[PDB]
Structure 1
């Protein structure tokens, strides 16, 4: 806001109907140019945020996949525990046999 106000302070808008001279392709083209550059850098800041939150969503997906890995593992484990509980059942039936 400040740098633009400073620029319009150096170049008083518009069209040069008043500021002595004809309609300035050079000068007005300069104001458009400046508006471009400050626009560009602002947009680059936002795109920077988009990239940062993008990385955060990506790594979050890594966490999701890995936790889920451990979970499925654990439910497997408990399945094996009810197994070896059964095999125990058959080894005790062995004892009593």
Structure 2
């Protein structure tokens, strides 16, 4: 949209605008100015776009680190149950000592 807008203004600017005894007044540089504006805008839009991609990759890396954490917590939970099974035996052997 900005590229079309700048090209349209550039093309509409080359027609002369003062008349009668003085003529011309058309700024000859308008096409180079429009190519400069659109080509310097391009850099900003590529920075915005690259920042959207880098934000997305950040959220993805964070989610994978939550898999590492969730799996660690589940494994610790799982080993505690077997610890309880061993202690249930150890207690049966203490009742039997009684």
Q: When the two structures are superposed, what TM-score results if normalisation uses the length of structure 1?
A: 0.62
User: How many aligned residue pairs are there?
Assistant: 95
Q: CA deviation at 1:29?
A: 6.2
Q: Which residue of 1 aligns with 2:89?
A: 86
Q: CA deviation at 1:32?
A: 4.7
Gaps of 5+ in 2: none
Q: CA RMSD in A?
A: 6.0
Distance (Å, rounded) in 1 between the aligned partners of 2:32 and 2:75: 63
Q: CA deviation at 1:39?
A: 2.2
Q: Assess, with a 3 A threshold, how the Cα gap between structure 1 residues 22 and 79 changes in structure 2: closer, same or farther.
A: farther
Residue 18 (structure 1) aligned to one of 17, 21, 30: 21
Residues 71-80 or 23-32, more deviating: 23-32
